[PDB]
Design a protein around this ligand. Structure first.
Ligand SMILES: Nc1ncnc2c1ncn2[C@@H]1O[C@H](COP(=O)(O)OP(=O)(O)OP(=O)(O)O)[C@@H](O)[C@H]1O
Ligand SMILES: C/C1=C/C(=O)O[C@@H]2C[C@@H](CC[C@H](C)/C=C\CC1)O[C@@](O)([C@@H]1CSC(=O)N1)C2
Ligand SMILES: [Ca+2]
Ligand SMILES: [Mg+2]
Lengths: 30, 349
């Protein structure tokens, strides 16, 4: 409930754009 | 100054304040003029309905009653004074998202608002942004692979059975044992039996080849044997209730196999479980075993199933709402005044 918030904050900080993930083939609509 | 977090489930509402270690309000998602506990305890006058079915809001008037009750009666807050983070099921129709947003801004006058996919929140609660979530509640089950906070819609698997179907199935098999559980009240009794005595066998055939007493309100002491593990086995073998679908282990594998080859390793190593129906003793070890049997030996499998996992979705929301990186993500009353309900698709992803 707070013991993971630092790590998570760090990960979300460098979150990639949806568009970038769609470009690299990871993100696809159903 | 303090964000509200609400996880609206098919069976239970979980609501509270960001920063807490658990939703301070947990109550039945039912409306009778009467909501939740008040609604049940007065079963004899009103007609009780569930406004959410299989994770999707289907009765909007009653849902509005749920939210109103949540703000005013349970949390005792004024909606206008708190940013509010809500949850939604994987594959929730767009129109539903917009309607949720519209209600929050126009009916409840929230200063700010956000909607997150349940499974993404439980992943977040574990401090991860990539992994695959098995989220199972009262109404629906999903495998949801996630890469950098984005659920991958093409790889999401839905299993159309969850806790309520498990309870119904235990009613059935206990009835075959000679007892009789048929009515709604009896269904509640059986749900209690399920939560107290059921578990997942590591090896189902071996377990079958190999018991507890439960006292009913009327004073009768019944005995439960293989039912204890036969009930949740349905998760792994849906044909027990006549479903043609593959079990949760197989669908975890299939979901992973629908994903980009180079993220698969990361999904196998980060398998999160969340929701009330993942609370069975032995379920984490059984999934570990089944996934290991399905996967290549070149793979590290890890199942993250913390003790508080029943509430991981809510907990995820609570963590997320308090992060600095998230504050620019809130939909403000201004942005909604400038774009209407459709701002939700742009802002909440
Ligand atoms: N210890 C337990 N063992 C087995 N099942 C449990 C346990 N605790 C709760 N459950 C079941 O979990 C279900 C409720 O869980 P939860 O609150 O996560 O569902 P929900 O969020 O309301 O449903 P959904 O996410 O499907 O809309 C009920 O079926 C309940 O009987
Ligand atoms: C203790 C409890 C747990 C729960 O999960 O409850 C939720 C909500 C509840 C609504 C009706 C019930 C009579 C009201 C109160 C029960 C709340 O229905 C459930 O019990 C249903 C019916 S049986 C089952 O397994 N899911 C799940
Ligand atoms: Ca924590
Ligand atoms: Mg849920």
């Amino acid at each position: 409930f707070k013991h993971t918030s630092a790590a998570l904050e760090r990960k979300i900080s460098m979150r990639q754009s949806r568009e970038e993930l769609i470009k690299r083939g990871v993100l696809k609509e159903i | 100054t303090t964000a509200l977090v609400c996880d609206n489930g098919s069976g239970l509402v979980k609501a509270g304040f960001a920063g807490d270690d658990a939703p301070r309000a947990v109550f039945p998602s039912i409306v009778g003029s009467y909501v939740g506990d008040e609604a049940q305890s007065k079963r004899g006058i009103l007609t009780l309905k569930y406004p959410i079915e299989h994770g999707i809001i289907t009765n909007w008037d009653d849902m509005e009653k749920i939210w109103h009750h949540t703000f005013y009666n349970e949390l005792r807050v004024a909606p206008e004074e708190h940013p509010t983070l809500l949850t939604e099921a994987p594959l929730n129709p767009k129109a539903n998202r917009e309607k949720m947003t519209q209600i929050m801004f126009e009916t409840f006058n929230v200063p700010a608002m956000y909607v997150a996919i349940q499974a993404v929140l439980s992943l977040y609660a574990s401090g991860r942004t990539t992994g695959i979530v098995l989220d199972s509640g009262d109404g629906v089950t999903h495998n949801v692979p996630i890469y950098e906070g984005y659920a991958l819609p093409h790889a999401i698997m839905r299993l159309d059975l969850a806790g309520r179907d498990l309870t119904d199935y235990l009613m059935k098999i206990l009835t075959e044992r000679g007892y009789s559980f048929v009515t709604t009240a009896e269904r509640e009794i059986v749900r209690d039996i399920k939560e107290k005595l059921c578990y997942v066998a590591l090896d189902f055939e071996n377990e079958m080849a190999t018991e507890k007493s439960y006292e009913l309100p009327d004073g009768q002491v019944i005995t439960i044997g293989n039912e204890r593990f036969r009930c949740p086995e349905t998760l792994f073998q849906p044909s027990f209730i006549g479903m043609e679908s593959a079990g949760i282990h197989e669908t975890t594998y299939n979901s992973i196999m629908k994903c980009d080859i180079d993220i698969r390793k990361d999904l196998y190593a980060n398998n999160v479980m969340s929701g009330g129906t993942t609370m069975y003793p032995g379920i984490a070890d059984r999934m570990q075993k089944e996934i290991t049997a399905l996967a290549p030996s070149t793979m590290k499998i890890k199942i993250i199933a913390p003790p508080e996992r029943k509430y991981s979705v809510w907990i995820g929301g609570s963590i997320l709402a308090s992060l600095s990186t998230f504050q620019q993500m809130w939909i403000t009353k201004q942005e909604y005044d400038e774009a209407g309900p459709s701002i939700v698709h742009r802002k909440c992803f």
